[PDB]
From a paper:
Very recently, another BTB-ZF protein, ZBTB10 (zinc finger and BTB domain–containing protein 10), has been reported to directly bind a telomeric variant DNA sequence, TTGGGG. Unlike TZAP, ZBTB10 requires two ZF domains to fully recognize the TTGGGG sequence, which represents a different mode of telomeric or telomeric variant DNA binding. Roughly, ZBTB10 follows the well-defined one finger-three base rule of C2H2 fingers, with each of its two C2H2 fingers recognizing 3- or 4-bp of DNA.
The G-strand sequence of the oligo is “TTGGGGTTGTA,” and the C-strand sequence is “ATACAACCCCA,” plus a 5′-overhang thymine on the G-strand and a 5′-overhang adenine on the C-strand to facilitate crystal packing. We determined the structure of the protein‒DNA complex in the P212121 group to 1.8 Å resolution, with the Rwork and Rfree being refined to 20.00% and 22.50%, respectively. The overall structure showed that each ZF recognizes approximately 3 bp of the DNA duplex, with ZF2 mainly interacting with G3G4G5 and ZF1 with G6T7T8 sequences. The positions −1, −4, and −7 residues (Arg767, His764, and Arg761, respectively) make direct hydrogen-bonding interactions with G3, G4, and G5 on the G-strand. Arg767 and Arg761 recognize guanine in a similar manner, with their terminal Nη1 and Nη2 groups donating hydrogen bonds to guanine O6 and N7 atoms, respectively. His764 specifically recognizes G4, with its Nε2 group donating one hydrogen bond to the N7 atom of G4. In addition to these base-specific recognitions on the G-strand, we also found that the position −5 residue, Glu763, contacts C5 and C6 on the C-strand, with its side-chain carboxyl group hydrogen bonding to N4 atoms of both C5 and C6. In addition to the recognition of G3, we observed that Arg767 interacts with T2, with its guanidino group making van der Waals contacts with the C5 methyl group of T2. Similar to the recognition pattern of G3 and G5, G6 accepts two hydrogen bonds from the side chain of Arg739, the −1 residue of ZF1. Unlike the G3G4G5G6 tetrad, which was specifically recognized through hydrogen-bonding contacts, we observed that T7 and T8 are recognized mainly by van der Waals contacts.
Numbering used by the authors: 716 to 772
The structure:
DNA sequence: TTGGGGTTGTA
DNA sequence: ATACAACCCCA
């Protein structure tokens, strides 16, 4: 693309409105996930995903 | 159920 | 401005 917007994702067409949303989005462009369930070991990209997941246990 | 879009808050 | 968050909602 020829979008020079500083909030455009370098890896896909996504363009953020907020700097912190771009930061969050960039975490989908990696295999390393920062959060884990201490019961079953599953790995999640967002902290809120572990909270939602806890209903499993 | 999960991944990632939204809008949003605090320090 | 950045470092952590939050809940909602669709797919
Ligand atoms: Zn992207
Ligand atoms: Zn678990």
């Amino acid at each position: 693309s020829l979008i020079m917007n500083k909030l455009k994702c370098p890896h896909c067409s996504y363009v953020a409105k907020y700097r912190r949303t771009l930061k969050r989005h960039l975490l989908i462009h990696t295999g390393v996930r920062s959060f884990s369930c201490d019961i079953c070991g599953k790995l999640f990209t967002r902290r809120e995903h572990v909270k939602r997941h806890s209903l499993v246990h």
